[PDB]
Amino acid sequence: GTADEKRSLQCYRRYIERSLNPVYVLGNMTDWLPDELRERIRKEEERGVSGAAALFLDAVLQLEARGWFRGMLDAMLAAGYTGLAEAIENWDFSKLEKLELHRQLLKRIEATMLEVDPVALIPYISTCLIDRECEEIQQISENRSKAAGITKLIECLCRSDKEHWPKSLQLALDTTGYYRASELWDKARSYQIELAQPAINGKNALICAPTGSGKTFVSILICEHHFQNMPAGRKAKVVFLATKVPVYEQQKNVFKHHFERQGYSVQGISGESVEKVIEDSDIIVVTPQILVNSFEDGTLTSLSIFTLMIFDECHNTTGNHPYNVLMTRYLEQKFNSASQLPQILGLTASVGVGNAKNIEETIEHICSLCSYLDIQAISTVRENIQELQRFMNKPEIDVRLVKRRIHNPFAAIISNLMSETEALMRTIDFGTQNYEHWIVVTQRKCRLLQLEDKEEESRICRALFICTEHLRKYNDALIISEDARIIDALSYLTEFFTNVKNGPYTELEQHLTAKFQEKEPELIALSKDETNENPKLEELVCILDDAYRYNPQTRTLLFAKTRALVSALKKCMEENPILNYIKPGVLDNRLLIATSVIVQCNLVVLYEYSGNVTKMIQVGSKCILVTSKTEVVENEKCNRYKEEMMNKAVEKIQKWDEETFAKKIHNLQMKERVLRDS
Structure with missing residues (x-):
């Protein structure tokens, strides 16, 4: 009409x-x-x-x-x-309506976007915005300021009328590398054969090989040699037990991918009937607690079903762990029924040392584990050590202690602002990746809320996000101050607030920015001191300068704690006369600086890595670890010793003859029934 x-x-x-x-x-x-x-x-x-x-x-x-x-x-x-x-x-x-929750969310998280680059985002979000919207941002963004830019963009993205946009934003944030805001938007080798041999020869094995040498592979080699040499009538079943839920699934898929094509039935039972799945399956990848429950339950009371049990992370076979509960049952079926038990295969990175002080106590520990699983031989690479070590250069970890900054008054000035800001956030343990993670956890909580008075709830979250964003910045700034120079710390915040001001500059944002600027001129004065020199840093620069004389064609990769620090450290290296010669890149360039997580490289230097290293390092040969914490120097000294001791034990055990070994094991199993009757 x-x-x-x-x-x-x-x-x-x-x-x-x-x-x-x-x-x-x-x-x-x-x-x-x-x-x-x-x-x-x-x-x-x-x-x-x-x-x-x-x-x-x-x-x-x-x-x-x-x-x-x-x-x-x-x-x-x-x-x-x-x-x-x-x-x-x-x-x-109905389409424009369904956006109106995402629009309410964006404005809610806008505090997160402030520092996002609207130019770099535009092509991915382009079909959401109108013609002249796209090009207005670009003008604001160049001519005026990048924060004033991203503010305009998110204005228009709320005025977007296109059902597909929230999805386009999520892929926009993902691809432009704004993971934080995005996340918040919602045939064998020789050594391998050697490892498999005793198990191919039917013996209950415990494969102790390091991670990434390919234990899951050897386990699938053992399998295709198990079905192949399966005698007479008996059909083979295999059970692949994995501890954790994801670990389990990677494997379930490994075995699915490889064995289905050959004609086998490969299923995987997990927390999310047992009987049919088991007898219809040729290979079954499983969580251990599933068997334990559906054994005690009554769904299955015959471990003779399987011809091979593989135990991933088998060093867990102690105490109440289900592997030990499953092996408890295996050991009485050996003793009592004397029927037909399956072959056991244990997979592990390291069998451990327990509480052993000596190679003697260790042997007793290692043996004890082998008893629980009923092992007959411990398979470790011994003939192809050459080939293994080549296949994975376990870096030696030259570990350096480094004196740090005794007083850090910048730190204390910031801390107080953090405390004020926290308490202001309450109206509505710093300098650590604990805090970082805490913010990520608190923020995901505001993302949720959605409680009653949406207008009051809109303002409360808006505010919570502002605050957490500031805290996070301050947090990042403390860290900068502790591993890098104090000027880098101050700068880092200065540049933030100069944004905050160009942004939407809320009533709150003003306050905070004000509250900072009250303290500003102290911090400024702190940077200007020959008192803001940071020995930890001076030590790293001297480690590097030593690393370019024993080899000046060295190609170093340096890991810093945060992103913030990579950029801080980049300046620090540029400005230093000791690394005068070296111009540093970031992730021609012989010193690339990246952060804690495939660049070709020479020497790796971890700069305060809180935690173990060999694991960090795999995402040639030479690796330095600069910490200020003795705790970690005497920790990762205590590991070296316990691993090196474990090996002495294992090789010593390996040099026994079958007889002694199978007997020793058999005793320890016996002592256990003797302590069950008492």
Whole structure:
């Protein structure tokens, strides 16, 4: 109709005025609106973008000229409003409605975006925004400021009328590398054969090989040699036990991928009937607690079903662990029934040392484990040590202690602001990746909320995000101050607030920025001191300078604690006269600086890595570890010793003859039944 088209555009008023910027569709409304109303709208756009979309909508609903409604829809498609043209032409706004939760969220998390680069985001989010929206950002972003830019972008992304946009944003944030905001948006080798041999020869094995040498592989080699040399009637079943839920699934898929094609039935039972799955399957990858339960339960009471049990991370076979509960049952089926037990295969990185002080106590520990599993031989690479070590250069870890900064008054000045800000956030343990993680945890909690008074809830979250964002910055700044120079710390915050100001600059944001600037001139004065020199850093620069004389064609990779620090350290190396010669890159360049997580490289230097290293290092040969914490120097000294002792034990055990070994094991199993009867 005509009086129907004006009633139906009045009832759905809200949706149109909260998406359309009218000054884009006014070129193609050239006939029906006068020239005084196309101008008085564009002066209102300068006050309200939605205020302008309420003056255009008014002076259209009073209009009567020949089918202005058809020129509107044509003009809207003209501007680029495809989801509005469909919404108002099919009278179904369900798509524009479903955005209105994501719009409420974005504004809620806007505090997270401040420092995101709108230019780098534009191509990925382009189909969401209108023609002249895209190019207005670009102007603000270049001419004025990058924060003023991203603020404008997220204005327009709320005024977006395109169901696909929240998805496009998520892929935008993912690909441009803004993981934080994004996450918040929602045939064998020789040594391998050697390892497998005793198990191929039917013996209950415990494969002790290091991680990444390919234990899962040898285990699938053992399998295709188990089905192959399976005698007479008996059909083979195999059980692959894995401790953790993900570990389990990677394997379930490994075995699925490899063995299904050969004709086998490969299923994987897990926490999320046992009987049929087991007898219909040729290979079964499983969580251990599933067997234990469906044994005690009664679904299965015969461990003779399987011809081979593989135990991943088998050093867990002690105490109440289900492997030990499953092997408890295995050991009475050996003793009592004397029927047909399966072959055992144990896979482990390291059999451990328990509480052993000596190689003697260790042997007793290692043996004890082997008893629990009923092992007959411990398989470790011994002939192809050459080939293994080549296949994975376990770096030697030259570990350096390094004196740190005794007083850090910048630190204390920041801490107090963090404490104030926390307590202000309460109205509505610092310098650590604990704190970092705490913010990530607190933020995901505001992302959720969605409680009752959405307007009051909108303001409470908005605020919580501002604060957590600031705390996170301050947090990052302390760290910068402790591993890098104090000027890098100060800078880092200065540059932040200079953004905060260019951003939306909320009532709160003002306060905080103010509260900082109160303290500013102290911090400034701290940077200017020859007192802000940071020996920890001086030591790293001297480790590096030593690392370019015993070899000046060295190609170093240096791991810093945070991102913030990579950029801080980059300056620090540039400015230092000791690494005068060296210009440092970031992730021609012989000193690349990356952060704690495939660049070709020479010597690796971990700069305060809280935790073990060989694991960090795999995502040639030479590796330094600069810590200030003795705790970690005497920790990863205590490991070297316990691993080196374990090996002496294992090789000593390996040099026994079958007889002694199978007997020793057999004793320890016996002593255990003798302590079950008492």
